Design a protein around this motif. Structure first.
Motif: not given
Length: 225
Positions: A92-99, A121-127, A160-162, A176-180
């Motif tokens: 799960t990768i959350f875009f700062k002020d976005d989706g 799967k992508g959601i909540d994005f600003k166009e 981590f975050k990029i 980023h939030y990851q689990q292997n």
């Protein structure tokens, strides 16, 4: 049963199905990996036409088993320690002020090729935002990724975050939030905390007419002691 499979140059195939805000797309990638050298050489192609998001937003998603583990820290190589069976990578990768992006990847050998099959799967994005409205510069910063065991999941956790740079001199945070976890029934290496140091370069193949990305990465383990 794991380190050995990464001894030479390994062939790689990757397949990604995507849908970002109802926007459906595909990517297929082929390349080579050389763990001894922390080296990745890949080419991605948008097989459904133009990519709807920025190529730089798919970079992290694009094979940690190709990390280069220095001798003293090889006990911490959970990635290769799960092959050939492989692992499932979730993020799960959350875009700062976005989706945000939800991904599921299946890393494993198929015969002699190292495959990674992914859905995202992508959601909540600003166009009009950085993502959907293409404001990211085609480049990549360098960074460290901190690895930790997860002895419940019997795998690991990564946080981590990029930061993705914007023309409008700003940057776009991507957390980023990851689990292997091991696809197998087998023994795996559970590492003590340490990290993965990355360096990436995006590029283009001149000859290519389709929407693609050329990616060269170099990954090295550090943090142990």
């Amino acid at each position: 049963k794991g380190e050995e499979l990464f001894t030479g140059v390994v062939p790689i195939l990757v397949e990604l199905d995507g849908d970002v805000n109802g926007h459906k797309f595909s990517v297929s990638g082929e390349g080579e990996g050389d763990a001894t050298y922390g080296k990745l050489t890949l080419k991605f192609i948008c097989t459904t036409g133009k990519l709807p998001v920025p190529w730089p937003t798919l970079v992290t998603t694009f094979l940690q088993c190709f990390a280069r583990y220095p001798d003293h820290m090889k006990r911490h190589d959970f990635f290769k320690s799960a092959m050939p069976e492989g692992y499932v990578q979730e993020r799960t990768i959350f875009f700062k002020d976005d989706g945000n992006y939800k991904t599921r990847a299946e890393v494993k050998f198929e015969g002699d090729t190292l495959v990674n099959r992914i859905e995202l799967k992508g959601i909540d994005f600003k166009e009009d935002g950085n993502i959907l409205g293409h404001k990211l510069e085609y480049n990549y910063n360098s960074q460290n990724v901190y690895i930790m065991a997860d002895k419940q999941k019997n795998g690991i956790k990564v946080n981590f975050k990029i930061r993705h740079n914007i023309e409008d001199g700003s940057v776009q945070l991507a957390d980023h939030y990851q689990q292997n976890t091991p696809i197998g029934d087998g023994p795996v290496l559970l590492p003590d905390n340490h990290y993965l140091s990355y360096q990436s370069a995006l590029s283009k193949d001149p000859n290519e007419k389709r929407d693609h990305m050329v990616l060269l990465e170099f990954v090295t383990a550090a943090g142990i002691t």
